Amino acid sequence: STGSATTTPIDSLDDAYITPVQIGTPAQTLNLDFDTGSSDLWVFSSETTASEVDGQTIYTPSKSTTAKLLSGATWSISYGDGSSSSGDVYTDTVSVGGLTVTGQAVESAKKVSSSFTEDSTIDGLLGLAFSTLNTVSPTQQKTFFDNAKASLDSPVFTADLGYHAPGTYNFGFIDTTAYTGSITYTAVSTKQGFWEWTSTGYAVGSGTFKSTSIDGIADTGTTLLYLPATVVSAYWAQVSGAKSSSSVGGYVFPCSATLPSFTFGVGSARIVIPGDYIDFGPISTGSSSCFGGIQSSAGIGINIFGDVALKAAFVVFNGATTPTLGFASK
Numbered sequence: 001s002t003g004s005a006t007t008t009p010i011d012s013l014d015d016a017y018i019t020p021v022q023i024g025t026p027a028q029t030l031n032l033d034f035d036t037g038s039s040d041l042w043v044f045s046s047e048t049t050a051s052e053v054d055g056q057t058i059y060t061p062s063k064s065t066t067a068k069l070l071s072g073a074t075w076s077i078s079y080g081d082g083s084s085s086s087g088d089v090y091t092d093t094v095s096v097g098g099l100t101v102t103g104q105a106v107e108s109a110k111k112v113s114s115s116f117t118e119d120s121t122i123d124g125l126l127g128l129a130f131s132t133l134n135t136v137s138p139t140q141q142k143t144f145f146d147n148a149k150a151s152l153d154s155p156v157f158t159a160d161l162g163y164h165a166p167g168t169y170n171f172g173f174i175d176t177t178a179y180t181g182s183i184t185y186t187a188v189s190t191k192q193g194f195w196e197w198t199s200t201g202y203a204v205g206s207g208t209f210k211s212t213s214i215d216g217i218a219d220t221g222t223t224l225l226y227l228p229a230t231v232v233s234a235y236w237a238q239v240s241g242a243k244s245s246s247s248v249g250g251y252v253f254p255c256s257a258t259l260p261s262f263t264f265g266v267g268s269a270r271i272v273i274p275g276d277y278i279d280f281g282p283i284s285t286g287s288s289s290c291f292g293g294i295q296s297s298a299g300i301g302i303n304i305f306g307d308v309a310l311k312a313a314f315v316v317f318n319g320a321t322t323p324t325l326g327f328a329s330k
């Protein structure tokens with residue numbers, strides 16, 4: 001089997017991407033944020049505290065003939081940005097892009113933090129990191145990918161995120177029309193439950209490539225590129241008037257600037273992030289200070305290749321016995 005779904009920016013900045021997901025019978029379609037940095041499939045629901053729902057579409061298990069309470073199971077998750085959610089668990093039929101999993105754990109939110117309530121466009125998350133990070137207790141649950149894997153034509157999924165445009169998530173096959181050149185595969189460590197890999201270095205604009213190992217994770221659920229402070233300082237030093245602002249919470253730059261590209265290494269290959277991808281626009285409406293898309297990881301404990309980086313590539317998440325990541329230009 002295979003599946004193929006279009007993923008769409010939630011706003012004009014590509015803050016996140018949503019992908020329609022069918023849950024239940026008859027189908028209830030919710031727009032979920034596919035997150036390769038977490039392992040819970042959770043949704044706004046008929047159980048979510050009413051004051052914490054503001055425009056989201058909800059899953060109502062009582063309207064699904066295939067929904068079953070997963071008796072005694074609870075979940076609670078905290079993300080890198082300080083947001084959180086928790087609740088109870090149903091199993092139900094979940095389909096993505098024509099690929100169906102029966103008995104998928106659908107984590108129904110009873111409570112969500114303010115940042116979820118305030119985002120009317122995101123109806124929940126679909127985690128695609130390793131199932132060792134799933135938060136369901138007392139019986140940990142599998143991701144949608146892990147449940148689909150044995151049925152897929154090839155044990156893979158691919159992320160093809162758009163810059164200010166829709167893109168695609170495919171399951172079970174690699175669309176050889178979706179990228180240019182060849183795919184470079186690189187090793188993955190699953191020790192922290194992430195798609196963790198080591199980049200071979202970076203360049204800023206037309207500058208020399210610096211060969212240096214940068215461990216980090218491939219995370220579709222993170223908007224920006226978080227790298228070591230040395231690398232980030234080297235990038236923003238090439239932008240007149242850029243500075244790190246403790247008031248704003250990262251590097252800002254004059255909106256009048258033209259940003260340089262950023263290149264990262266994948267083995268002997270190179271992925272180039274155009275400068276425009278690193279513009280996240282005014283810090284507040286009408287400001288002439290703009291927020292940068294490359295930020296320091298120093299206050300995180302891990303480097304994160306988020307959407308800024310991933311959208312510059314066709315990315316293969318190879319879930320074979322020995323997982324690997326692949327990157328191609330596009």
Ligand SMILES: CC(C)(C)NC(=O)[C@H]1CCCCN1
Nearest residue numbers: 016079081083115116119221
């Ligand atoms: C995408 C935004 C708007 C940050 N929503 C959130 O509060 C979620 C997004 C996925 C990672 C954890 N935080």
Ligand code: NA
Nearest residue numbers: 249280283291
């Ligand atoms: Na922000």
